[PDB]
Amino acid sequence: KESAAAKFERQHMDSGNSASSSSNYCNLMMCCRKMTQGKCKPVNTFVHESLADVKAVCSQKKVTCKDGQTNCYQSKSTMRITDCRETGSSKYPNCAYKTTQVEKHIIVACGGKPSVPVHFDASV
Amino acid sequence: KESAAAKFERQHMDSGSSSNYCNLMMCCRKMTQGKCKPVNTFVHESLADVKAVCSQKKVTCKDGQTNCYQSKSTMRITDCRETGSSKYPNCAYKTTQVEKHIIVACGGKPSVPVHFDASV
């Protein structure tokens, strides 16, 4: 049972986050996308291109995954992505991340039928 | 079960700013599950300052209860309101940052904020 006091803090308190969206993007997104539950996911990449363009990567340059598997593909062009990396002061449940925006080629593993992205491998 | 494709979308896709704050925070703080919460307010002062309000100006709550207190000074808050085109599960909010007095209900022992009544 969530106590009234705990409920109040969850619904109405935001003292920790900086008012700059440029800086708090990862903190908020990592939390919204459930990657801070139980443990703070160390690193994560978000892609800002269209879903169609990311799915199109599955029929582009074939490359070997970092884990030795062979269903990885590299994007023909760079894509706008955001790197979220856990900071030194991060400590679950207080997960903290540094947000970094860059434009790189991405490598994703594809699977299923039709073949779609199922794993983000890397950015080059 | 979440499919592999759905998992990729949840963990890595964000197709297409501070005006996006409410959309993300409301999601993060789990207030967009089951239905979209129409309105919500986030306080950006330290927890210690908000708790202190419980021993400041005593007022009547909007619902008629009498355990409400108002902050002696303004506080930085963010107002979140469903936009004209919000519709669960696709909740959408308008972010508005302002400085206003807050009114909260206090309860429990020690007496702490347990409900956000309004801002003025």
**For chain B, what is the domain count?**
1
Find residue A86's DSSP bridge partners. Answer: A97
CA–CA separation, B90 and A89 (whole Å): 33
Cβ–Cβ under 8 Å, residues A105 and A79: yes
Residue with tokens 């972010």: B95
Method for this entry: X-ray
Residue B72 in marked binding region: no
Alpha-carbon distance B10 to nearest alpha carbon in chain A (angstroms): 6
Alpha-carbon distance A68 to nearest alpha carbon in chain B (angstroms): 19
- CATH number, residue A60: 3.10.130.10
Instruction: Tell me which residue range forms the domain holding A99.
Output: 1-124
Cβ–Cβ under 8 Å, residues A73 and A63: yes
Catalytic residue of the set A60, A82, A119, A120: A119
Query: Resolution for this model in angstroms, one decimal place?
Result: 2.2
CA–CA separation, B81 and B92 (whole Å): 8
